[PDB]
Ligand binder design. Sequence first.
Ligand SMILES: CCCCCCCCCCCCCCCCCC(=O)OC[C@H](COP(=O)([O-])OCC[N+](C)(C)C)OC(=O)CCCCCCCCCCCCCCCCC
Ligand SMILES: CCCCCCCCCCCCCCCCCC(=O)OC[C@H](COP(=O)(O)OCCN)OC(=O)CCCCCCCCCCCCCCCCC
Ligand SMILES: CCCCCCCCCCCCCCCCCC(=O)OC[C@H](COP(=O)(O)OCCN)OC(=O)CCCCCCCCCCCCCCCCC
Ligand SMILES: NC(=O)C1=CN([C@@H]2O[C@H](COP(=O)(O)OP(=O)(O)OC[C@H]3O[C@@H](n4cnc5c(N)ncnc54)[C@H](OP(=O)(O)O)[C@@H]3O)[C@@H](O)[C@H]2O)C=CC1
Ligand code: SF4
Ligand code: SF4
Ligand code: SF4
Ligand SMILES: [Zn+2]
Lengths: 49, 114, 95, 156, 297, 208, 176, 380, 31
Amino acid sequence: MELLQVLKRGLQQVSGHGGLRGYLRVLFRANDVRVGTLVGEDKYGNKYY
Amino acid sequence: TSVKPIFSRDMNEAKRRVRELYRAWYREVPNTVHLFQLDISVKQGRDKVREMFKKNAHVTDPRVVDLLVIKGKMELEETINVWKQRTHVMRFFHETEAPRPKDFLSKFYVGHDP
Amino acid sequence: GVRTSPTGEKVTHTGQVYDDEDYRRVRFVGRQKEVNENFAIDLIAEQPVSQVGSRVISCDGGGGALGHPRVYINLDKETKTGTCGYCGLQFRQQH
Amino acid sequence: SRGEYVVAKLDDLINWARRSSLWPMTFGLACCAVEMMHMAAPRYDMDRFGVVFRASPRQSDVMIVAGTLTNKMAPALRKVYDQMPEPRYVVSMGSCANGGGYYHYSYSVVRGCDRIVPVDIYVPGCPPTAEALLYGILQLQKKIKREKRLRIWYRR
Amino acid sequence: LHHAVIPHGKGGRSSVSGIVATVFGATGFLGRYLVNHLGRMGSQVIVPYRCEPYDTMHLRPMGDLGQIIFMDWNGRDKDSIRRAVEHSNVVINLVGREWETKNFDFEDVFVKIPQAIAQVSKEAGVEKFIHISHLNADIKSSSKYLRNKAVGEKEVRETFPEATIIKPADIFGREDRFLNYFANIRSLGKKTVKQPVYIVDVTKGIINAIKDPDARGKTFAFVGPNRYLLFDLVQYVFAVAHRPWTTRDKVERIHTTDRTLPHLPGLEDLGVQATPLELKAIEVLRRHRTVQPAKTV
Amino acid sequence: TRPTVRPRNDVAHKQLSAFGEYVAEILPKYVQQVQVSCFSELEICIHPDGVIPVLTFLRDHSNAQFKSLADLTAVDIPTRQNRFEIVYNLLSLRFNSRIRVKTYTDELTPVESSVSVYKAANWYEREIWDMFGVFFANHPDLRRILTDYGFEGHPFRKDFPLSGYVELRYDDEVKRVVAEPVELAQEFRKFDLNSPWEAFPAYRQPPE
Amino acid sequence: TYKYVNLREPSMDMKSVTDRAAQTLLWTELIRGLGMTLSYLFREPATINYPFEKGPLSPRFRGEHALRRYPSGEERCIACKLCEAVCPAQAITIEAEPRADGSRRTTRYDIDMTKCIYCGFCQEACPVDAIVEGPNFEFSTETHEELLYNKEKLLNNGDKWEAEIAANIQADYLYR
Amino acid sequence: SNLTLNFGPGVLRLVMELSGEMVRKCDPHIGLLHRGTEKLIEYKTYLQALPYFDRLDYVSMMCNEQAYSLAVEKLLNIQPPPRAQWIRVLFGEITRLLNHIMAVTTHALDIGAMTPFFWMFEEREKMFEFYERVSGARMHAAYVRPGGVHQDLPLGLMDDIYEFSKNFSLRIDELEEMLTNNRIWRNRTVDIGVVTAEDALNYGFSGVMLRGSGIQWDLRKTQPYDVYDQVEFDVPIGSRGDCYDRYLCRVEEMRQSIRIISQCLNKMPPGEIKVDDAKVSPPKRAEMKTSMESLIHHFKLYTEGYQVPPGATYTAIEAPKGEFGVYLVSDGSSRPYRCKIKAPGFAHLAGLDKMSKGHMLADVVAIIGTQDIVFGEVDR
Amino acid sequence: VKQDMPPVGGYGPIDYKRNLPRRGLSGYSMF
Ligand SMILES: CCCCCCCCCCCCCCCCCC(=O)OC[C@H](COP(=O)([O-])OCC[N+](C)(C)C)OC(=O)CCCCCCCCCCCCCCCCC
Ligand SMILES: CCCCCCCCCCCCCCCCCC(=O)OC[C@H](COP(=O)(O)OCCN)OC(=O)CCCCCCCCCCCCCCCCC
Ligand SMILES: CCCCCCCCCCCCCCCCCC(=O)OC[C@H](COP(=O)(O)OCCN)OC(=O)CCCCCCCCCCCCCCCCC
Ligand SMILES: NC(=O)C1=CN([C@@H]2O[C@H](COP(=O)(O)OP(=O)(O)OC[C@H]3O[C@@H](n4cnc5c(N)ncnc54)[C@H](OP(=O)(O)O)[C@@H]3O)[C@@H](O)[C@H]2O)C=CC1
Ligand code: SF4
Ligand code: SF4
Ligand code: SF4
Ligand SMILES: [Zn+2]
């Protein structure tokens, strides 16, 4: 079943934002919870994915 | 010196058209004060109509006063039909404009304009 | 190379500063007078004079087509360096 | 004090509601309107910010002046502005609405809609991009966020 | 006279009038039309504001770009007053409240703040200072408003001896609290005589007091051309408005007769023709519609 | 002269010259000039009494059939005593061709309206009334179409200034948009751009 | 070389008449339209997450103006007034003089960003790449006069955005 | 008596004389966007006058650029290089897609079908990315100039135009699935705004307003400009003169624009993009900074501008709204003496009064939709 | 020279016609 892969991608988004705290952090600051490869970080703390 | 007329063959027909336009504006001023809910009186609007007619009172060319009657009829059509707003009717009354210096001495005081 | 008037207002690289009795300082009250503190007249004086072995040198400002139109500078005066009219880089014949 | 904290939290609440439920009335005057239509288009999608597409003028919260304001339409602009209920805001969009723009020296053009209505946000460009207009709307939301209505009421 | 403050232009919006005005209380009823009439000349107008900046938005179309400078101020902060007046060549005081609040009584609004503005404007080198008292200001008045406003007039006169003090009687206009008070009261009729003055007459008088060098040190009384009894005035207001928030101090001031001061100059000595009520009461009271004129004395 | 030069169309030039001769000899009562430009456009310069007979000819003649009025235009040339140059651009879909009919008037002589020939003219000459002040006689509803309602003057006249004479602003005292004499914070900067060297010797005017 | 939209005569046999009657009574094309709307319901939307995601741009993009420098700190503008001559809005106002080392430099370089039509004729008229129309489009202001840029603002925009402007010019100058 | 409704302030004032549901008289008051564009053109050079044409029909920017450029190039007696002409036809048909998306989707939005607006404006956003990649601006490109185009295509742009064009016909298909066979859309368009062929010719109509009435006229076929005689496409012809056949003509013109764009992508030639007369088009920046003649010509073209020989042309194109014309009069100087702008929407909105007689008030917004009216070009 | 050009064989075929795919049962079958 491919719905289980969808639920596992959601759970690994929760795991990839460093747990539920970072998940809710990016959910409420970003309105977006998808994970990406960290391309970089500037001298201010802006992270680029 | 032989030119093509617009409406009037001479100045008498031209004065007839001026006179009918003045009659129509005189009849229209109370309705204009009412439906635009202006803050002026009917006497003040009729004085403004008389001022606008007397401003052009020096013209002796029948074609020029024919065009003045045509433009006055256009302004009246824009007034009777509600095409003007209240602002366009009140632009004849330069109310926010400060009074210009009239004599030599006050024009000397304020600036360089003759 | 910014400096400061006795009013406390910064003087621009043009030399603009309002007078003390000028009312137009009130536009900076509670706000700031934006000046650029990288004065181009001081930065081009920091560049060293290029010693070349030719009588006539060419300058395009560097970068080829990214610079300025290529001009030719005579270096026959030994009293004065040869200054580019576009970029302000200056040249000296080494003999 | 206790009442200062209460009016601070109530200011934060009403500013949250007003900036997260901005309803715009867009004056679609000229080319800028097209770009406003791209800020409602699915790429930028103003509706996900709470910014509804084409609110009616008597229930709108911000007037977006998007286009050239001519002399023949400036009383209609002022009339629609006067019919907007408070709190009303005005975003000036693009060079002709901001200062006259390409038609600044024209006999028939108002040199900026700030001669007619008070303007909160000036969005520059000819046209500004839909992303730049969305930037200006989010800057208007930040301007609403730091309003101090009940704190100034409590201090007066 | 500095070169940037020499007058230029034809007196329009982009012109330079040479007037650099700090208008305290510009966000109110008189300040609205004063900043209007200053900004249409091309004056530099400094608006110190206490309120939300939203509530200053209507002052922004009134002048050319950079001709209205908004800045925060506090009435109990002399640093903000000095920050607002130190570039101006005229300071107008329009600070007032019809009611006393929790933080500001009539002594704060009418004595403390005007004396602070006048003292700081004196020690900042401001040439002209205009203060707005009330016509019925008296030490032995029955209302706390008029008592504190007479005390504040005295203190403004003694700390800025060249101040132009202006006595308006009862100012009517679109945003007044005189005809709009009577039209929304739906208190009674007594032997009170009033001559209300129109707001554009008051504004023209203030700006002619800016331009007249003879208005320094004077006390003007801005009154309307027609004195009315209170009863038939209120009946005229209910007749024009097509009709069949208050405090007891406001009731004491409505039942206070507008005194006659012939020794003080008025609007005619500043070149202002006082507009009668019957020309402008329809313009005020057209909003209240869902006429034989009042009898003068 | 191959790559950068526009190629000349001699066939269309010859055809439009023959048709210009045709129009000039069918209608000698009104046709004053006939010219064909080097980019092959035909201009029939007529007397203003023949606005209706020429345009009805070109609309209805079987060898013309200029059924479409593409554009109607005035040009202000103040050095002429008939300063306004009324320009009709006509399209024949049958013969795939365009023609230009030009006439003239001053400020006071009315031009006969061509709404009875082309109803398309109804707004265009109305625009010519608004922008230039040319009165069109026997027009159905002649009034302004583009300027503001109380607008004084005709803006596309070359003695009318670029910014006008009045400008609008909202005045809060009268609660109304008001018109005032125009003051610009920055004057329009007039550029004198013309080189003092002759550009085109083929267009040299003969001297005094 | 031409085609006739809507010149189909419908078939009048009982098959096609019954097809059209079934379409009329059973609302077939309406269910087709509902199917197309339902099909977009299950598509990923085109919405990017502004401000965290940005609309794609090119290095040619005409945004906020900037005055540039040489790689020595010397400003590129030699006051030739080509940009204000070509400026279709007359948004540019230039005054100049020789400065203290005799260099031809501006004392006034104003761009009214509310007159400006953002067409980039100034950067293509500029012989030394001094004025550029950079990549910034997020510079909305709360007041009209904050968009009346003087030379100090434009030089600070150059010093602010030069790391991006030089790389955009590097990507595009061979097309110019 | 009969009712008079003043539908106040694109933006339009309408004075309706209604007799119940029916429309007796429709008087469109315009000038709400009259900006005096063509008086401003007289005080500017030809290059300076070019960006005013972006802002007339502001959903058809590069087409109006092309019409003005063709007028100036006709008066200059010069021709653009072939690659410039192919770029102009490519972006003119991209522009035609932009305008017909705007036309069809806002005409559906004003009737009540709000969803294909949102579906097609993402495709419109991708074409604005094409404008931005070729010129730097999403809408007012100032790209098609007298002499050719301003700048050559960036590398990889034609591949992305191919990737757009390969998928755009499915977008037209789902628009046409939403509207064309829909009985509600047919009830709002089929008997609405019927124009006869003779009245459409007499009222100065052009474009789809002629072709919906069956008139076989298209200026890309009959009076062809840059390389439109080298591309193969069909001209959709209506049969009933109504809103619905004009809708179908605009949809099929989007189809044929995709066809032309495929032919332009396959037949794009190499070479320069400006005319190689440096007294007309500015030289390249590398030779401007190296050659004396090139620097002089750069200086004079960007300050004085090129002198145009004296004369008057009427140059028209098949813009997506119809015949877009410029009557351009040069006095010999580097500034236009006169520039009359013929817009299709002017005569179309003049014909609105005949088109709306005998219809309902809800039909008038459909007729103002089927006349593709942008008031920038209507009012100038 | 290097210029934005089509590839060597040109681009692939681009669909441009109406494709309304004619789905559904017959009118006989739907009653
Ligand atoms: C619990 C669910 C309830 C809802 C179910 C449906 C949900 C989905 C609806 C989607 C569409 C919604 C669209 C909104 C607008 C609707 C417009 C519309 O359709 O208008 C009505 C349209 C109007 O059609 P029209 O007017 O457009 O078509 C032209 C018609 N002439 C040519 C005659 C003028 O259709 C109807 O009026 C049909 C009414 C319903 C009929 C139902 C079927 C009856 C069949 C009986 C058997 C017949 C057998 C053959 C005869 C022999 C008998 C013995
Ligand atoms: C039948 C069921 C019906 C259900 C109806 C309601 C459905 C939606 C329910 C809520 C969904 C989640 C909402 C989350 C709101 C945002 C919370 C949040 O994080 O707010 C942050 C904000 C600022 O916090 P700050 O401390 O400044 O952050 C800096 C951190 N370093 O802090 C704040 O803003 C202050 C805290 C605000 C908390 C608001 C919580 C939501 C209230 C919704 C009302 C209804 C609640 C449920 C009612 C039914 C059940 C009892
Ligand atoms: C004595 C102390 C108490 C005094 C009285 C107050 C009672 C409680 C009132 C609600 C809580 C007060 C604080 C309100 C929010 C303040 C903080 C805030 O604004 O946080 C911002 C945060 C979102 O951040 P933002 O800046 O919007 O982000 C930009 C987008 N990236 O915002 C969020 O994360 C969401 C904020 C949600 C706000 C709370 C939820 C709504 C209000 C519910 C109660 C009132 C309504 C009752 C029911 C109405 C009808 C349904
Ligand atoms: N009928 C009349 O109007 C007459 C008025 N006067 C006097 O003329 C003056 C102006 O009148 P008017 O415009 O009608 O009055 P308003 O009440 O309308 O406005 C008064 C102004 O003073 C400000 N203000 C009030 N209290 C304070 C305070 N404690 N600290 C700082 N600012 C304060 C207000 O600002 P904010 O909006 O922030 O509260 C407002 O800008 C007053 O002094 C009044 O007494 C005299 C005769 C007649
Ligand atoms: S600022 Fe520019 S793009 Fe915007 S409406 Fe004005 S002319 Fe059109
Ligand atoms: S982008 Fe165009 S309008 Fe703006 S400053 Fe440059 S030349 Fe002037
Ligand atoms: S074109 Fe360039 S060098 Fe010349 S004045 Fe303008 S910015 Fe300076
Ligand atoms: Zn150099």
